Amino acid sequence: KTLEFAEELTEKGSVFLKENDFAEAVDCFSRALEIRVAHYGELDAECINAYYRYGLALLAKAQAEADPLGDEDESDLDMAWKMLDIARVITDKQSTETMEKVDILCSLAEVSLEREDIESSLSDYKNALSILERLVEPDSRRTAELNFRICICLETGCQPKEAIPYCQKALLICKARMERLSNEIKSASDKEVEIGDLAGLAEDLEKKLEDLKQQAENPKQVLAELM
């Protein structure tokens, strides 16, 4: 019932989650959240973390208990959505947007992908990216990553034309970060290793961009514009 006991439940839930004991992790995080809500209120800022942890554990559980070939799984997904969305709504009442909000939005996007809801995941990622563009440097790897996740959501959703500028942005971010590290060299070993890493990533992104431009030329994709 005390806050310290909720803290013990949270630490043990984290351990259970690392050890792939998803059921017990969800039980611990559920109990910690209930204690925190009873102390601070259902929609209080002090509960954000506990909602987030619980949502994350539920997502993990739903992913591990699904069989791709073919319910606890759908119920856990719906509850993960609920808990992460409450974390988001509470976060929305704070003046400054933080990386925790970015992360909550990315976790919500992943829930939506598991529910096969590409539109929601798209909105979640776009929101997260617009926050990230205020929080971190223009050539941040996290910004490149979110651009890429947007473009693959759009590709899987039959919108390759729209995916193209997001993939291009991810590629340009990788090359800009390359050139910036190159100028800084002008830890040196660490920067040069990262330059090579980014060059490989850029080539993978350039291949993805070629495939996207080809998909956007498919007759059904392009006829409306041609007409």
Binding site: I152, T156, L201
Partner: peptide, 15 residues
């Protein structure tokens, strides 16, 4: 569905 190569590339981009 999203290809596993694309998931891996997203994680590599993030690092």
């Amino acid at each position: 569905t999203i290809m596993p190569k694309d998931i891996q590339l997203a994680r590599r981009i993030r690092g």
